[PDB]
Structures are given as structure tokens and as C-alpha cells.
Amino acid sequence: EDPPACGSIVPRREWRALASECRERLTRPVRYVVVSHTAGSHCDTPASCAQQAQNVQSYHVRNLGWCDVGYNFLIGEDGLVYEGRGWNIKGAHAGPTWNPISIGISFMGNYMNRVPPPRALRAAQNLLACGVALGALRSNYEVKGHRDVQPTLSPGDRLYEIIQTWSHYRA
Amino acid sequence: EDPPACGSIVPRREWRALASECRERLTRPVRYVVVSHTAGSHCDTPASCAQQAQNVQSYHVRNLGWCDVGYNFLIGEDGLVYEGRGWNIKGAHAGPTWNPISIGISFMGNYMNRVPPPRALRAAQNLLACGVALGALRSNYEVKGHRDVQPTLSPGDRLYEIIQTWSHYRA
Amino acid sequence: EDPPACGSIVPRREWRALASECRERLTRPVRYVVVSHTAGSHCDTPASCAQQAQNVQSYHVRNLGWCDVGYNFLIGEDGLVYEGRGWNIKGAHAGPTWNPISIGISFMGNYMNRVPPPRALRAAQNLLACGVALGALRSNYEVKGHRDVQPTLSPGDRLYEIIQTWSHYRA
Amino acid sequence: EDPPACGSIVPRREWRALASECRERLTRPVRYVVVSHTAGSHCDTPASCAQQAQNVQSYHVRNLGWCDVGYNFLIGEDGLVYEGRGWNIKGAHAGPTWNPISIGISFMGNYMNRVPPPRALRAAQNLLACGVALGALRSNYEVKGHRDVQPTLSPGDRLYEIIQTWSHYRA
Ligand SMILES: O=C(O)CCCCCCCCCCC1CCCCC1
Ligand SMILES: O=C(O)CCCCCCCCCCC1CCCCC1
Numbered sequence: 186e187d188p189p190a191c192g193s194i195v196p197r198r199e200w201r202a203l204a205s206e207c208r209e210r211l212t213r214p215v216r217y218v219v220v221s222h223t224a225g226s227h228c229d230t231p232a233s234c235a236q237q238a239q240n241v242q243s244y245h246v247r248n249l250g251w252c253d254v255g256y257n258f259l260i261g262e263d264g265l266v267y268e269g270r271g272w273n274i275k276g277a278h279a280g281p282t283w284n285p286i287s288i289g290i291s292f293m294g295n296y297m298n299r300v301p302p303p304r305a306l307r308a309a310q311n312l313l314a315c316g317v318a319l320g321a322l323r324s325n326y327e328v329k330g331h332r333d334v335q336p337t338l339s340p341g342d343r344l345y346e347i348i349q350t351w352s353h354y355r356a
Numbered sequence: 357e358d359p360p361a362c363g364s365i366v367p368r369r370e371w372r373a374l375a376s377e378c379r380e381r382l383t384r385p386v387r388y389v390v391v392s393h394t395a396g397s398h399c400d401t402p403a404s405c406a407q408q409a410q411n412v413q414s415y416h417v418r419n420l421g422w423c424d425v426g427y428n429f430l431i432g433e434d435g436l437v438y439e440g441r442g443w444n445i446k447g448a449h450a451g452p453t454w455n456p457i458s459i460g461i462s463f464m465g466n467y468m469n470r471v472p473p474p475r476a477l478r479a480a481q482n483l484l485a486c487g488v489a490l491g492a493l494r495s496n497y498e499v500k501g502h503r504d505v506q507p508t509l510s511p512g513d514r515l516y517e518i519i520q521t522w523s524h525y526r527a
Numbered sequence: 528e529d530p531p532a533c534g535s536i537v538p539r540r541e542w543r544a545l546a547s548e549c550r551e552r553l554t555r556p557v558r559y560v561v562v563s564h565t566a567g568s569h570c571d572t573p574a575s576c577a578q579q580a581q582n583v584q585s586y587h588v589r590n591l592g593w594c595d596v597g598y599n600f601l602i603g604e605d606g607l608v609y610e611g612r613g614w615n616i617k618g619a620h621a622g623p624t625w626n627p628i629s630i631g632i633s634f635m636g637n638y639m640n641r642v643p644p645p646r647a648l649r650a651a652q653n654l655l656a657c658g659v660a661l662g663a664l665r666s667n668y669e670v671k672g673h674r675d676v677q678p679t680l681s682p683g684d685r686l687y688e689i690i691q692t693w694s695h696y697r698a
Numbered sequence: 699e700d701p702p703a704c705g706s707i708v709p710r711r712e713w714r715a716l717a718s719e720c721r722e723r724l725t726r727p728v729r730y731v732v733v734s735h736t737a738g739s740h741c742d743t744p745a746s747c748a749q750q751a752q753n754v755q756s757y758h759v760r761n762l763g764w765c766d767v768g769y770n771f772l773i774g775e776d777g778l779v780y781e782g783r784g785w786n787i788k789g790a791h792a793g794p795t796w797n798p799i800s801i802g803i804s805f806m807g808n809y810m811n812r813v814p815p816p817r818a819l820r821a822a823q824n825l826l827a828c829g830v831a832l833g834a835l836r837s838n839y840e841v842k843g844h845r846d847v848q849p850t851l852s853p854g855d856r857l858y859e860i861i862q863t864w865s866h867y868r869a
């Protein structure tokens with residue numbers, strides 16, 4: 186009983202993100218977590234992965250005109266978590282039905298035929314424990330694959346396969 | 357007030373579509389068309405394609421719980437157009453901002469590494485010409501690639517390459 | 528399906544309802560829920576609200592010739608849910624397009640210049656979760672105001688504004 | 699501001715309750731449910747029952763010096779459940795043996811030669827099921843009359859014979 190209790194997360198500024206313009210808030214404790222993949226290339230060093238989070242955000246902000254990067258968090262192959270819209274802000278990653286009730290975490294890369302390395306999976310699962318510890322997620326939150334709530338291949342066959350084994354997975 | 361029979365279109369009953377539960381209407385004339393791909397398996401024959409349209413609909417209806425397959429029309433490699441939600445019903449293809457202002461056509465298959473055959477491309481273009489003559493689409497309608505309004509690989513690199521050349525395409 | 532029954536509902540017999548002659552069943556699970564107001568007298572007490580339920584049913588059966596109170600459920604300002612045709616029977620409350628696909632719940636009163644109390648709103652929302660849990664409603668169900676599916680003032684400006692904030696509301 | 703759920707409970711603030719000062723927590727899943735009657739005045743309308751929960755709490759807080767009304771939940775003859783200490787706070791209703799291992803619910807009134815109306819009994823069981831849904835109550839939960847765990851006439855002969863006919867009642 187040490188209050189914070191969880192997660193090292195690379196913050197927005199540390200990855201030089203553009204300021205967010207999003208104001209819509211999620212209502213904690215959140216019950217659903219939606220796992221996607223960027224379906225782009227991977228990265229496996231702090232500097233590349235930080236560079237890739239900037240790209241993704243650029244796509245969503247510069248091209249799509251969104252208020253900030255879609256995801257609440259992004260997972261690098263560097264084994265670090267990148268802060269997106271975070272725990273309190275409604276993300277734009279699952280559709281109008283799941284966005285206001287979920288936390289979207291996206292693995293940077295394409296896992297159709299490839300798996301995230303062990304450290305990326307640990308960072309993702311540690312992030313979720315962190316979420317529960319903070320009361321950001323319900324203790325009995327449910328994890329969905331992106332393809333379970335939207336017509337997409339996301340998070341990729343290999344990763345989809347993995348999250349299906351998870352404690353909190355519920356299709 | 358003279359209308360043409362531009363419909364080469366395979367009716368829902370003909371591809372044996374489950375009945376639609378969708379009620380929200382599109383107001384005509386519609387200004388935008390959003391092109392996507394199913395990122396699925398392709399089909400080249402009226403028989404294999406009717407089957408594919410069934411599966412794509414099954415996925416959206418049975419797995420995702422939607423009122424009907426999300427696209428307004430699907431395009432087969434058999435060179436035929438499969439009726440989805442049609443010209444009058446709002447689709448569920450490109451998010452809450454674009455769904456209500458556009459018609460969503462999806463080519464059945466994954467075009468990341470393949471272009472659709474000429475006849476598939478002819479069908480799509482003919483469908484659009486059809487739409488204009490029917491008054492369903494504004495004559496100066498704009499084409500967008502899925503990845504232009506939502507974060508996706510869709511419609512696939514090759515197919516995206518192609519649509520960027522189209523007369524009605526717009527940044 | 529699932530043993531655990533749901534919610535507190537004032538049964539037909541308790542509010543002394545005339546027996547139903549209504550036979551057309553709804554197809555479970557139902558996708559839509561239409562919210563109306565009776566535009567009639569309000570009541571704040573079990574005694575007065577049972578009475579009002581009786582009068583609404585009476586007027587529908589005796590003056591309109593319907594087989595049963597047209598609503599599937601009624602909501603009182605006493606904060607209780609009154610059993611109408613229930614979950615399995617088709618109501619007569621939204622027109623012929625909608626009556627066969629939806630559940631109709633009506634707040635007893637006229638909401639144009641009044642909002643119904645929190646307990647009424649609570650009863651209504653709780654009833655819907657119960658329907659979902661029972662399998663009578665789709666987990667994804669969509670809530671609509673009576674005025675969205677028919678030309679009407681129902682459910683009344685004030686109540687219509689409130690249901691627009693419901694997490695399952697789709698215009 | 700905490701408004702989800704559930705068994706349709708009138709929240710603390712809605713009945714104008716003094717803020718609680720209790721800090722002791724209950725270890726969920728809880729095992730026992732004790733049923734008592736207030737032995738006070740009964741009420742049949744939301745207005746009168748809110749006033750009655752207030753009176754009970756005031757007596758407990760001003761006169762006995764307790765941190766909060768001692769019951770976790772109060773049941774009014776209006777068919778509504780009134781929030782007391784709730785699911786997460788240890789109450790003061792059945793003694794030091796029973797207060798830390800049980801949830802105490804109290805029917806407002808004197809049921810010696812009187813019976814609570816069906817709607818009051820409905821709210822009660824509905825309350826109990828919603829407790830399970832949350833993990834606050836263990837599905838195996840046993841129901842005890844106040845008089846089964848303490849020397850007291852509570853909850854009254856009449857109400858006591860009834861709770862014995864309940865499915866989870868253990869003598
Ligand atoms: O979570 C939200 O949508 C609000 C954040 C604002 C940025 C997004 C703009 C909305 C434009 C439609 C884009 C689709 C993409 C998939 C998720 C549902 C929205
Ligand atoms: O929202 C309202 O005002 C109406 C009440 C909804 C009915 C209750 C649903 C039964 C299952 C409880 C689910 C709850 C547990 C509390 C936290 C969020 C979800």
C-alpha cells in the first residue's frame with residue numbers, strides 16, 4: 186500500500202506527440218478492452234517505436250482530422266507502452282458502440298502471420314493490471330479482439346490467437 | 357424523368373441474403389462513395405461469389421450482431437455487383453461521420469498484393485454510373501478510399517493505387 | 528435459456544388488467560426499443576399508477592379495439608414498471624413497420640413540459656438491461672424515440688432530450 | 699455521479715441522506731443476508747418512504763451516534779429499495795457476530811400482525827439477485843430472519859413466516 190502501484194509508460198511528450206484536442210471522457214471503471222494492431226510496420230527500440238507512434242498519430246490527425254491518435258495506448262516491440270488518449274479520454278478505434286465503453290490498445294505492427302515478442306505481450310498485460318489497480322478498468326474487465334467488434338483482420342491472426350487464451354478474454 | 361435499367365446487380369434473394377433488419381435511410385442524392393475491400397478471400401464465379409457475399413454478411417450479422425452486411429454493394433471478381441443495403445439504406449462501413457453521407461462499395465477479396473480484374477473494376481464504375489442516372493448519387497460525387505476516412509489498409513495498396521486515378525476521386 | 532429471472536415488474540394481475548387476446552409473438556432477440564409517453568395523466572403512487580395502467584389498457588381495448596394495452600411495458604413516476612404485453616408479444620405502439628421489430632415502453636404522463644423523475648428513468652433503463660439479460664433484447668439493442676419512427680410529439684420534448692443521452696440511443 | 703444500476707435503488711442523495719462517516723468495509727463475496735423490519739412507521743409512496751428512511755437514519759446517527767443508518771438497504775412498501783450503507787460497507791443491524799459476515803436489509807414498518815405488499819417483497823429478492831450480479835453476494839447466499847440470529851421479534855411474525863418460504867432461506 187503504496188498508492189500508484191503500476192506501469193512505466195512513455196508519456197506523450199516523451200514521444201513528441203501533438204497536443205490532443207479531445208475532450209470526451211470515458212466513465213471509469215471501464216469494462217471493455219479492445220486489442221487491435223496498427224497493421225503497419227513494427228519497431229523495436231525506444232527511438233523507432235517513439236517515431237512510429239508519431240506516424241500513427243500523424244495519420245489520424247493530419248489525414249483523418251481526428252482530435253488525437255485513435256488508441257488509448259500503443260504497445261511497442263521495444264517492450265514499452267506509449268501513451269495515447271489514455272485512461273480517461275474516449276478513443277476512436279472501435280466504432281461508436283465500443284469506443285465510449287472501452288479502452289483501445291493497439292500493438293504497433295502487423296501480426297497476421299507474426300507474433301509480438303514476449304516483452305510486448307508482458308507490457309500489454311502489465312498495462313491492464315495497472316488499469317485495474319487504478320480503478321480505470323473493472324476488476325473483471327473483458328478483452329475483445331478488434332475483429333470481434335468491427336469488420337477487420339485486426340489484431341492479426343497470430344495475436345488474435347494469443348489474446349483468446351487470456352484470463353479476461355470474452356468473445 | 358426518364359430512367360434506365362442500369363442494374364446488372366444481383367439481388368439479395370439471388371445470393372440468398374439473410375433478411376435485413378436495417379431501418380436508417382440515406383437521403384438522395386448522396387455525395388460520397390467509399391471504396392473498401394473485405395480483406396477476405398476472393399471469388400471469380402457467380403456461384404463462389406454468391407457464397408462469399410453470404411459469408412461476409414454472416415460475419416457482420418451473426419458475429420458482429422449488425423442489422424445487415426455493412427456495405428451498400430459488394431463487387432465480385434466474377435464481374436457482378438451484389439446488392440448489400442442498396443441505395444436507400446445507410447451502411448455501416450466507414451464510421452459515423454461518413455456512413456450517413458456516403459454509399460460504401462467493397463470489392464470482395466484482399467487487394468494489398470493483387471489488383472481486382474478489369475471486369476470487377478468495370479462493374480464498380482458501371483454501378484456508379486448507374487447511381488448517377490438513378491439520382492441516387494450526385495452527378496459530381498466524390499470517391500474516397502476507406503483508408504482515407506478511417507484507419508485501415510483497406511481497400512488494399514494496389515486497389516487504392518487504382519482508385520486514386522479515377523475521375524471522381526478526391527483528396 | 529438462463530434460470531436467473533430479472534427485474535421487479537408489477538404483473539398484469541396486480542394492476543388488475545383485463546386478460547389479453549393478443550397472439551402474434553415477437554422474434555427474440557429484439558433489436559429496437561421505442562420510447563413513448565402516454566400523453567395522459569401521471570401518477571406517483573403504486574395505487575394511482577396501477578389505476579393509470581388500467582385506464583390506458585381500457586382505452587386501448589375498449590375504444591381502439593386492440594387485443595391488449597398496446598405497450599409492452601409502462602413506466603410510472605412511482606418508479607415501478609407495469610407489465611404490458613411483455614417481452615414475447617407484439618405490441619401496438621409504433622406503427623406497422625416498427626411494432627413487429629420492437630419493444631414499446633411508455634412513460635405514463637405527458638412529458639412535453641415535464642421530465643419524469645429519476646426513479647422512473649431508472650426503472651426504464653433497468654428493465655432494458657433485464658431484457659438483454661433475458662435474451663428478449665439484443666445486447667446491442669438500439670433505443671428510439673417514438674418521434675424518430677413516427678410523426679409524433681411522443682415521448683415529449685423533455686423526455687426525448689433525456690433519452691438522447693442514453694448510451695443505446697440511435698436517432 | 700455513480701448512477702448505473704441496478705435493482706433500481708433510490709440513491710443516498712435522493713432520499714436526502716446525511717453523509718455517511720463509516721469506514722469499515724465488508725469482504726465480498728458476502729455469505730449471509732439478514733432480514734429485519736424497522737419496527738417504525740411504514741410508508742407506501744416514494745415521498746413518504748424517502749421521509750421514512752431519513753427518519754430511521756436520523757435516529758441512528760443523531761441519537762445512537764452511529765456513523766450511518768445501520769442497514770445496508772431499506773425496503774419501502776412503495777416497492778422501492780433505499781440505499782443505506784450499501785454493498786461495500788459493514789452495517790450495524792444484527793450484532794458483532796453477524797454484521798461483518800452479512801448484508802442487512804430492512805423492511806420499513808412493523809410486520810408482526812402485518813405483511814409487506816408483493817412489490818415490497820419483489821424489490822427485496824430483485825435486490826438480492828443484483829447483489830450476486832456484482833459479486834457483493836455469493837450465489838450460495840443464505841437468508842436469515844433477524845430473529846434467527848438475535849433475540850428480537852424483528853422482522854415480525856408475519857414477515858418472518860414469508861421469508862421462510864424463500865428459496866435461499868436457512869433456519
Ligand atoms: O471516439 C470518437 O469517435 C471520438 C473521437 C474524435 C475523433 C474521431 C472522429 C470521428 C469520425 C468517425 C471515425 C470513427 C473511427 C472508428 C471509431 C468511431 C469513429
Ligand atoms: O443505469 C441506470 O440508471 C439504470 C440501472 C441499470 C440496471 C442494472 C443492470 C444490472 C447489472 C448491473 C450492472 C451495473 C453494475 C454497476 C456498474 C455498472 C453496471
Ligand SMILES: CC(=O)N[C@@H]1[C@@H](O)[C@H](O)[C@@H](CO)O[C@H]1O
Nearest residue numbers: 280281282447448449451452455
Ligand atoms: C459496431 C458499430 O456500431 N459500428 C457501426 C458504425 O460504424 C456506424 O456508425 C453505424 C451506422 O449504421 O453502424 C454501426 O453498426
